[PDB]
Amino acid sequence: STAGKVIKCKAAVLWEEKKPFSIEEVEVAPPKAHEVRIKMVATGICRSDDHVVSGTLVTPLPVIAGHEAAGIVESIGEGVTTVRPGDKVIPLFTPQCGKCRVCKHPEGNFCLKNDLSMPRGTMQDGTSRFTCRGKPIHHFLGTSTFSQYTVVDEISVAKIDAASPLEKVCLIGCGFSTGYGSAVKVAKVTQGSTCAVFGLGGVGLSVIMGCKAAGAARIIGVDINKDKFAKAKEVGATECVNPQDYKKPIQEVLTEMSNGGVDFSFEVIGRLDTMVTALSCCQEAYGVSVIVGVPPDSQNLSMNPMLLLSGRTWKGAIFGGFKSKDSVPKLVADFMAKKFALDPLITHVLPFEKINEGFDLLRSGESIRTILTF
Amino acid sequence: STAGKVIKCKAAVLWEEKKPFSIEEVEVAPPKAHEVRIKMVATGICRSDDHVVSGTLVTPLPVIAGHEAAGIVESIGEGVTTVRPGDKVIPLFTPQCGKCRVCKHPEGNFCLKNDLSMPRGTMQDGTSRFTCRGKPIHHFLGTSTFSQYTVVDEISVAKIDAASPLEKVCLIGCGFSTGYGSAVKVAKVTQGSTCAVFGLGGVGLSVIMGCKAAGAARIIGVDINKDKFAKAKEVGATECVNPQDYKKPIQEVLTEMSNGGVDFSFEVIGRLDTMVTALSCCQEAYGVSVIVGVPPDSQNLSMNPMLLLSGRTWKGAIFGGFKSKDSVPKLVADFMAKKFALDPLITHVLPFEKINEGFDLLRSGESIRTILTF
Ligand SMILES: NC(=O)c1ccc[n+]([C@@H]2O[C@H](COP(=O)([O-])OP(=O)(O)OC[C@H]3O[C@@H](n4cnc5c(N)ncnc54)[C@H](O)[C@@H]3O)[C@@H](O)[C@H]2O)c1
Ligand SMILES: NC(=O)c1ccc[n+]([C@@H]2O[C@H](COP(=O)([O-])OP(=O)(O)OC[C@H]3O[C@@H](n4cnc5c(N)ncnc54)[C@H](O)[C@@H]3O)[C@@H](O)[C@H]2O)c1
Ligand SMILES: O=CN1CCCCC1
Ligand SMILES: O=CN1CCCCC1
């Protein structure tokens, strides 16, 4: 019906940083060879999308942001073999080309065709499929889900279970998987351990969920916003600490309460100082610290290398270490089988047209994940 | 004979930094409860001893430095049960108290009773057993092997095979063990991998021996002193690179020759910039970088957290990750059984009295390990 033809639809365009999104009419070109056009059904507001606005995460403007979503294939380009019109799908911000050295390596997931390192804001062929006022609008990480319709490369899409509830599983697109994998796959939290989680928003609460699934005996949530404590406790936190309540640095407090330092720490805020602080609070001979938060573009941190020399492990990862195409389907299956919960991360549901209000909820500290419905 | 009495002997004292060592007559107190007095037989000159000289490694002065050595027990204090007079022993700069949370932890080595973090330059009891001109002389990491006799705590000493050649196995006291473990136990080099070793001194060569034993297919040694390449090739390097031959930063060169980044990199020099560079040259998605070198006291480095966020693993270790007391004796046994070689790291042998010439050789870049005999 719309197959093979341009579609005109609503999309929230970010014309310049620091500005509200502009809900306008855009035109979405039909898919080319190995491209897939998807009808968005639900998209979550992740803090990284707000990073495109604030300048924290750099990518070419003007742009259609959004990367945490779920939709239905409207049509496929020639040669696509992994999805079909009608399929429920989850757009993949980190692609899985299956052919590069990282895709072939058993532990890598940062596919070399990503658009994160040298951001082009385009589709794999170097062009855009979006147009607004006669001008080309960039893509965001081969996803751009803040639109009723988007076009993604085949290596940036995964087919999921036809009965999943897309208004929930969209979290697997980013928030939930990132948090969870960080703990279980990257850190590899062990049973009986002591974990410290910095930052209690959506990804942090998912870190907490994974630690709790991993068998952790103590999970310390750290946040400067005490309204975040209750939910953190609800998903697994055994204690919660607000750094503003103490007279000494939080690493001292946490090393004191962990009797010497935690086995696993997680930075899930996106601040150079807490990254350092997170590493330090982990046991000096065998502690592991995972950076999940995105730092302000191009800024460096300062740290004493003796923090590593004594035996500490410092690591980071995009999307909880998950090889995107292969895990997303497994993750939805697991959610279908009640292996984990997504509801705790959803505090607000709004119509896509109220996207600007959804960022206001995020910025004021009132929400965790706001789900936008199309 | 000497048992129970003060021994007068020669020791190389370091009265102040930046000075040559002063061979002087010192008084060695008899061992107290759980202490051991050892007669030194062989001690190697490790770059960290020089760090005490240069101010790079800070510990209380005046001091008897020296920490890579092998001797013979002359007498034991009351309550000692692990070694007896006559045993061949290797002093342990990182103790193994067997009772703290790190000693109990299956992966920690950095025993909480070490004298590395808050240097006191005493024996476990807070007192010194060395006297010179009526003045108390500090110990160095509970070892201080640059003396004909020393007194160590029981948790800082290990009993080894009665027939090992002490003029060779003193290298298991520091150099060899640190290198080799760094590769095989800390980094865990994998068969068929590509490794990059920065620094081709005794430890670095030992890092290369461990990479080659782990099954590495490519081992690139990097040093600004080409005189070091031949020996690095001999123990296993497949290529050698000197950063001064290139007009581009060595991380670029390495990334290019490794077709995108190495699987494991090691900084074995002791510079904040090479630490950063070694991290960068490892593949961004799944590379591992291990800091072995000791950096300038209290100095911080600067690096971009995105090098971690894409997937890299950054870590460090004291003594190749080895639990000191349990591994020293096994390592000597394996050397006894010809599992690994120590001769390649020994380029000079000198009588103890010529300790300042041993340092000269190190500093001029002419030697790897100079072994001092008593
Ligand atoms: N690595 C990945 O693959 C990946 C994926 C998604 C998100 N991220 C990043 O993870 C971070 C978390 O995302 P989110 O969606 O949960 O964000 P969010 O804004 O919902 O959560 C962050 C939380 O940190 C807390 N916080 C802020 N300043 C703090 C301070 N000084 N000390 C302690 N706590 C503080 C806030 O109060 C907030 O609850 C972001 O920076 C985002 O870009 C990374
Ligand atoms: N972590 C531990 O437990 C441990 C144990 C022993 C030694 N160490 C540290 O390891 C380092 C190595 O000790 P070593 O005894 O082998 O020292 P060494 O001095 O024999 O070797 C250092 C090597 O680095 C090379 N080098 C110097 N500057 C360089 C630069 N800018 N770029 C590239 N190469 C450079 C020198 O030419 C030299 O061959 C020291 O810093 C020592 O303190 C750490
Ligand atoms: O939330 C998505 N992202 C984008 C990829 C880098 C980490 C943050
Ligand atoms: O070679 C010995 N050392 C002392 C312990 C810190 C690392 C260097």
Ligand SMILES: [Zn+2]
């Ligand atoms: Zn996100």
Ligand SMILES: [Zn+2]
């Ligand atoms: Zn790929």
Ligand SMILES: [Zn+2]
């Ligand atoms: Zn101990």
Ligand SMILES: [Zn+2]
């Ligand atoms: Zn040493």
